[PDB]
Symmetry: C2
Subunit: 268 residues, 2 copies
């Protein structure tokens, strides 16, 4: 053991999300927590759209309502294992509109974050079935007090969304995704730059497998504030356990103080 | 032959910039044009601060005044060699304030861009000598009509500065630098992500060698809209010649239409 206060042990579950089946998805997650959880794990990370996957045409019926089913499911697991869960995202109906809603729950079973994906793919029938988020991603604390941020899949292409959480003090950016195999290089390259430009840890938690339409990339990855690899996965399903040296954030921010030079009001 | 606007041949001059000596830097540049130019080259790119390098304490006496020396020097080369020159940047005085001023000149001797570096390096103590720019980087046209943008060194760490020129239609981002060897990984990782997130060509033109304080990386590179390597150099002083398939920009923008999803009023 290392004395507490400078590290965080993270498990990334690179799950093969079942197309349009919330009960098979919930069973798989329960089984992954049972097989993999230990007293030393601080945070578990789940991929994007873990309840129904990309079964967009059936979300009008299959999606959750006000995170009812998904929050209760995650709260039960968080409390049972006394662990924080950066609970990917879920297809969620709110006031007769379908959102791609990310959320996190702490070890005390409290909802700590809720965020609807701001950036819809104007190609992936996402404009046909989903509604774009109307709020920025806000920094929030994990159980150790560490400020973090949670963004979803396509959001990775938008450097603007991470700037506000980074300058507010966020130390870890959790990107939750179902990133295609066809754009694997983009996934690693963008996550690495998000880490460097904001001097912070970046965790990319991706899904894997084929859903009858799209082959997902797998290849979940952890990048430190310097842009160096902490740990990674391949295409196949598995868990990734990393121990993050949190001190590297303030160290990187002292060495390359980008936010002392930012010109917020100038950029067009 | 291919229709005008679909192709461009670019030469990148990875020069070892002489510390605080404008006359020797001009002699070296003239020698490189004489030795390297040919009738097929459309654009020549120089590194950042090519007149005095980083001799900050002597800029009050050594810097140019209102681009007088630098513009006349470059106008002569652009007109003699019938080529566009993305003239890196120079230490430049305006009303007793010293700027790091990038400029470009077309083959007809016209000044086509003037940009004062917006992001000064506090660790290099640039704020004690230089004045930060008051304007954004504006897209400008090269002789073939292609919209491009010119950014300086430390600007690379600020993703915001490239967003407006890219959404305005810029196809090439020219980053002109004196990037240190100690941050080589950051140079490659950031240039690659700027290309991907904006679906455009990125040309990183860097200096090389040792100025008596810092070892510069060299490693100039060209990245296509898909994030793939077009061409690159190593540490050594050399010229990089690349052929750009400009049609790749609009093709990439059609395939990954990020600016149809951008939420300009939302971001904090
Ligand atoms: Cl001027
Ligand atoms: Cl001509
Ligand atoms: Cl041209
Ligand atoms: Cl730097």
């Amino acid at each position: 053991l290392v004395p507490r206060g400078s590290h965080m042990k993270v498990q990334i579950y690179q799950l093969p999300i079942v197309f349009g089946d919330s009960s098979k998805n919930e069973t798989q997650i329960t089984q992954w927590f049972e097989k993999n959880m230990n007293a030393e794990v601080d945070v578990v990370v789940l991929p994007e759209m873990w309840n129904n996957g990309y079964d967009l045409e059936h979300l009008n019926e299959k999606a959750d309502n006000n995170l009812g089913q998904s929050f209760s499911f995650i709260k039960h697991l968080a409390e049972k294992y006394k662990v924080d869960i950066v609970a990917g995202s879920v297809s969620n109906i709110r006031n007769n509109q379908i959102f791609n809603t990310a959320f996190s729950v702490n070890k005390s079973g409290q909802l700590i974050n809720e965020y609807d994906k701001v950036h819809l793919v104007p190609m992936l029938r996402e404009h046909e079935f989903l509604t774009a988020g109307e709020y920025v991603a806000e920094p929030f604390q994990l159980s150790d007090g560490t400020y973090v941020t949670q963004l979803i899949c396509y959001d990775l292409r938008f450097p603007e969304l991470l700037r506000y959480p980074a300058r507010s003090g966020a130390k870890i950016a959790f990107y939750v995704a179902q990133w295609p195999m066809s754009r694997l290089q983009h996934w690693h390259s963008l996550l690495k730059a998000r880490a460097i430009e904001n001097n912070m840890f970046v965790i990319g938690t991706n899904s894997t497998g084929f859903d009858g339409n799209t082959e997902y990339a797998g290849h979940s990855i952890v990048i430190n504030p310097n842009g160096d690899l902490v740990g990674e996965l391949n295409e196949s399903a598995d868990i990734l356990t990393v121990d993050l040296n949190l001190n590297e954030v303030e160290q990187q921010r002292e060495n390359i103080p980008v936010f002392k030079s930012i010109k917020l009001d100038l950029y067009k």
